[PDB]
């Protein structure tokens, strides 16, 4: 064999996000991925991490340059806060030239804090000439892929209309004291529109094999002050600012077939009492097709899939762990592409094969900028060329 | 002291009034009694008066003889909307020769355009009669309960709202028996004006708030419908529809800047995994949801879900075998009767429980509808807050 060596920036073996998605996944693929490097701001944390989980081949690097430069890395994975994506990726991309073996750059969604930073990063990566990857795992949910198979095989006929509803999670009336104030402040690349909506609206475009045409959005901050609550759920009688949106009304048209799409994303709690919190309701000429969850987060949720002299079918994987599962699949697809199981390439687009690159992430960003731009200007925007230039 | 009804549009075999107004008036025989009955062809009036044994019905020959008589207390216009202006304008004038006229009652839509609407309101307002508009949605038991709950803080303040409806006729197929006028532009009947109009009015009426900003997209993705017979088979022949077959609406309630998301489907196929009519209201202390299978709130038997009382009780409320086609209209009449006898002539109902929707309410509704189309054309969100004032 020949396991792809992984260099990890952001693997904290106690906190963060990667420890609960990437790590478990890499484990279950021990012959194809093995963690080699591990940079962190404080090198102490790297060693502590390498020790907690008995990473046999992990080597705690001291600086960014020593880490990005080593030849023991085949794929680099950036899993830190989005706010730090630009500061870290840009230099790292440069230092990595001293490594002839680098074959894969892997970054978590969102890619940056703004269209601009996004454009910069893509360029910096494209010119370096490495295969890029974006953690849009939505594209790997078994449910998302089935829905895609069905729709592309004319199983529901042509699409007539579409409704969507999601939940951002954190942006309701209350905030727990333990939650970092950075996910509630503007400009940090994490929020209801960029993160939650971004993921979902990408799966949609990916399921239906169509980018958007015209769109119009309205972005709300009707909870400027959240009420602090403890663990039990009680209030400490203290309000803290949120400058980040707590509701999104999106609305537009798929380029293919001028298909109406209606969207509503709820900030957070309370949850919906009489409707699933995540819903993708696709309506066709020969049938319907609908995905439900209780999370609001498609990318890491276990869904149910319904799809209609009529024959209705429901499809559900009982006890399927989507938090690890979808990520796992993404890795599995990287491995498949590497050992040539089933050419370096620029973007996945609507293809089944391969995986979402940074180019896909970029286009997603162009759509997101449009959603905000549309809200500000208060006008429907033609967005057809977003996926070119 | 029965109220003497003059009916323009009561065809005792076809039309709409025969299946709503008529049955309702019957069940209120002591408070409403049909006296007059104008029609284009006086023959049809007599035929109608004869079919249903209307004891006091008098078939009038001309519009002027009908509008002018003193045997009418309330006039009810129930003809096609396309003919509302031609008929109402002159009739309003002739009716001056009748000192007893106390009520003008008109079916929604009121006119074919904002302009015609403005004209008619003026022509009515200056005549000085109490106007009424057939927005029966405001009388659905389900709509009134939802209104009680929301206004009593039962679901707390409103956080957000989703709506979904169905126009009925504007799918991929058209039956050969359906009049081509409901599929042509400019006739005051269509997915936006009619179906959306009714629903969006109930919303504003349930939540006691007009709109603030809105943005719409109006579709004609089926320009040619496929003709089908009774069984549902195709005659292999396509006919034009120039009227919308989908509406994306989206805006904000003036009260609490509440997001509202909307999607209205042209027609068939129906939705396989969701009710075809849905009003999903979300609050801070609870939710509240209305479902139907019709797509037409105003004439549908709904189910009402409402959690609340935060150790949290959910409740469902449904009137089994309640005929909404007749029921809602019936309620509207019942409320006119209540107001007349007094179980203070008034300009508009607004968000009040008491009374009934007047022509002023109909007008505002029209201003919103013009905005929806205007917004689609211009492709921009529109501030709409003053819609409910300006005595323009």
Swiss-Prot record, chain A:
Keywords: Acetylation, Carbohydrate metabolism, DNA-binding, Galactose metabolism, Repressor, Transcription, Transcription regulation. It comes from Saccharomyces cerevisiae (strain ATCC 204508 / S288c). SUPFAM superfamilies: Glyceraldehyde-3-phosphate dehydrogenase-like, C-terminal domain, NAD(P)-binding Rossmann-fold domains. It comes from the Eukaryota. This is Galactose/lactose metabolism regulatory protein GAL80. One of its GO terms (biological process) is positive regulation of transcription from RNA polymerase II promoter by galactose. To K.lactis GAL80. Present with 784 molecules/cell in log phase SD medium. This protein is a negative regulator for the gene expression of the lactose/galactose metabolic genes. It binds to GAL4 and so blocks transcriptional activation by it, in the absence of an inducing sugar.
């Amino acid at each position: 064999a020949a396991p792809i060596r992984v260099g990890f920036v952001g693997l904290n073996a106690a906190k963060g996000w990667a420890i609960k998605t990437h790590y478990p996944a890499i484990l279950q693929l021990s012959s194809q991925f093995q963690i080699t490097a591990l940079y962190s701001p404080k090198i102490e944390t790297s060693i502590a991490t390498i020790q907690r989980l008995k990473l046999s081949n992990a080597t705690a690097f001291p600086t960014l340059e020593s880490f990005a430069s080593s030849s023991t890395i085949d794929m680099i994975v950036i899993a830190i806060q989005v706010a730090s994506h630009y500061e870290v990726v840009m230099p790292l991309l440069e230092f990595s030239k001293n490594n002839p073996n680098l074959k894969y750059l892997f970054v978590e969604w969102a890619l940056a804090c703004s269209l601009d930073q996004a454009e910069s990063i893509y360029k910096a990566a494209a010119e370096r000439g490495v295969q890029t990857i974006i953690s849009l795992q939505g594209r790997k949910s078994p449910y998302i892929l089935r829905a895609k198979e069905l729709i592309s095989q004319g199983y529901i006929g042509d699409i007539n209309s579409i409704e969507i509803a999601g939940n951002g999670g954190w942006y309701g009336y209350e905030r727990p004291v333990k939650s970092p104030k950075y996910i509630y402040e503007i400009g940090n690349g994490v929020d209801l529109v960029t993160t939650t909506f971004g993921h979902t609206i990408d799966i949609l475009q990916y399921m239906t094999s169509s980018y958007f045409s015209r769109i119009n959005a309205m972005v709300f901050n009707n909870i400027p002050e959240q009420e602090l609550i403890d663990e039990r759920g009680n209030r400490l009688g203290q309000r803290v600012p949120k400058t980040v949106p707590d509701h999104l009304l999106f609305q537009g048209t798929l380029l293919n077939g001028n298909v109406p799409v209606s969207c509503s994303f709820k900030g957070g709690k309370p949850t919906k009492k009489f409707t699933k919190n995540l819903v993708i309701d696709i309506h066709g000429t020969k049938g319907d097709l609908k995905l439900e969850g209780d999370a609001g987060f498609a990318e890491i949720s276990n869904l149910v899939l319904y799809y209609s002299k009529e024959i209705m079918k429901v499809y559900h994987l009982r006890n399927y762990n989507a938090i690890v599962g979808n990520i796992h699949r993404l890795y599995q697809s990287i491995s498949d592409f590497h050992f040539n199981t089933k050419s370096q390439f620029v973007m996945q687009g609507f293809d089944f094969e391969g995986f979402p690159t940074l180019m896909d992430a970029l286009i997603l960003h162009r759509l997101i900028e449009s959603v905000y731009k549309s809200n500000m200007m208060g006008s429907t925007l033609n967005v057809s060329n977003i996926s070119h230039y």
